[PDB]
Design an enzyme around this catalytic site. Structure first.
Site, short mmCIF file in Angstrom:
data_model
loop_
_atom_site.label_atom_id
_atom_site.label_comp_id
_atom_site.label_asym_id
_atom_site.label_seq_id
_atom_site.Cartn_x
_atom_site.Cartn_y
_atom_site.Cartn_z
N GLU A 35 0.84 -1.25 0.22
CA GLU A 35 -0.18 0.07 0.08
C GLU A 35 0.70 1.12 -0.50
O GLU A 35 0.77 1.93 -0.69
CB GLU A 35 -1.14 0.05 1.32
CG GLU A 35 -2.57 -0.97 0.75
CD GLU A 35 -3.11 -0.53 0.09
OE1 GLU A 35 -3.24 0.25 -0.24
OE2 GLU A 35 -3.85 -1.32 -0.21
N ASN A 46 -8.19 8.86 -5.32
CA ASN A 46 -8.42 7.96 -5.94
C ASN A 46 -9.35 8.99 -7.28
O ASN A 46 -9.86 10.53 -6.57
CB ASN A 46 -9.59 7.98 -5.12
CG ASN A 46 -8.44 7.12 -3.97
OD1 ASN A 46 -9.00 7.25 -3.04
ND2 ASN A 46 -8.00 5.85 -4.31
N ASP A 48 -13.01 8.73 -7.45
CA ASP A 48 -13.66 10.53 -7.13
C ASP A 48 -13.36 11.61 -5.88
O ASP A 48 -14.06 12.08 -5.69
CB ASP A 48 -14.38 8.88 -5.71
CG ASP A 48 -13.85 8.37 -5.31
OD1 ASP A 48 -12.78 9.42 -4.28
OD2 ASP A 48 -14.30 8.17 -3.46
N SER A 50 -11.97 11.21 -3.93
CA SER A 50 -10.62 10.93 -2.60
C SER A 50 -9.32 10.68 -2.64
O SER A 50 -8.86 10.58 -3.01
CB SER A 50 -11.28 9.86 -1.77
OG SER A 50 -11.89 8.66 -2.93
N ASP A 52 -6.02 8.68 -0.53
CA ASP A 52 -6.16 7.49 0.39
C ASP A 52 -4.08 7.51 1.49
O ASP A 52 -3.43 8.22 0.55
CB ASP A 52 -5.57 6.11 -0.24
CG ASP A 52 -6.37 5.25 -0.55
OD1 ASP A 52 -7.61 5.99 -0.49
OD2 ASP A 52 -5.97 5.18 -1.84
N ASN A 59 -8.86 5.30 3.59
CA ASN A 59 -9.45 6.46 2.22
C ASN A 59 -10.50 7.57 3.52
O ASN A 59 -11.07 7.54 4.00
CB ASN A 59 -10.32 5.53 1.53
CG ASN A 59 -11.05 6.09 0.39
OD1 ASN A 59 -12.22 5.86 -0.67
ND2 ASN A 59 -10.21 7.93 0.57
#
Ligand SMILES: [Cl-]
Ligand code: NA
Length: 129
Positions: A35, A46, A48, A50, A52, A59
């Protein structure tokens, strides 16, 4: 902070992740590796909108507040920036809530695709724990 593998294994162990909801330590180390490459300061955006955050790429859509994800939730009740600390406490505590929500570690895509079903104990091999 960029953790070494065993350094991180030991920090996670200390914070109660070993066998947390049935996931052995190796699972957590492996997820972190893929990750964030063990980097607490990792961020990724991301589609959308958002973002991380941190060693476990938590998120903003549901878990933390970054002030820029409209309509989002803050289920860990924390600013996302707290997930970037060299101290992994906030990331671990939030991860515990995530893994407990019904879907286990499948919430972490890299875990599902790169750790699930593999020999995850290899990630803590050789570490003093
Ligand atoms: Cl589970
Ligand atoms: Na949010």
């Amino acid at each position: 902070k960029v953790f070494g593998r065993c350094e991180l294994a030991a920090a996670m162990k200390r914070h109660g992740l070993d066998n947390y909801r049935g996931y052995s330590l190796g699972n957590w180390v492996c997820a972190a590796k893929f990750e964030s490459n063990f980097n607490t300061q990792a961020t990724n955006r991301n589609t959308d909108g958002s973002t991380d955050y941190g060693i476990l790429q938590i998120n903003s859509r549901w878990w933390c507040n970054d002030g820029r994800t409209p309509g989002s939730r803050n289920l860990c009740n924390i600013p996302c920036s707290a997930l970037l600390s060299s101290d992994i406490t906030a990331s671990v505590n939030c991860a515990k809530k995530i893994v407990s929500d019904g879907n286990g570690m499948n919430a972490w895509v890299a875990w599902r695709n790169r750790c699930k079903g593999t020999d995850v104990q290899a990630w803590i091999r050789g570490c003093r724990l």
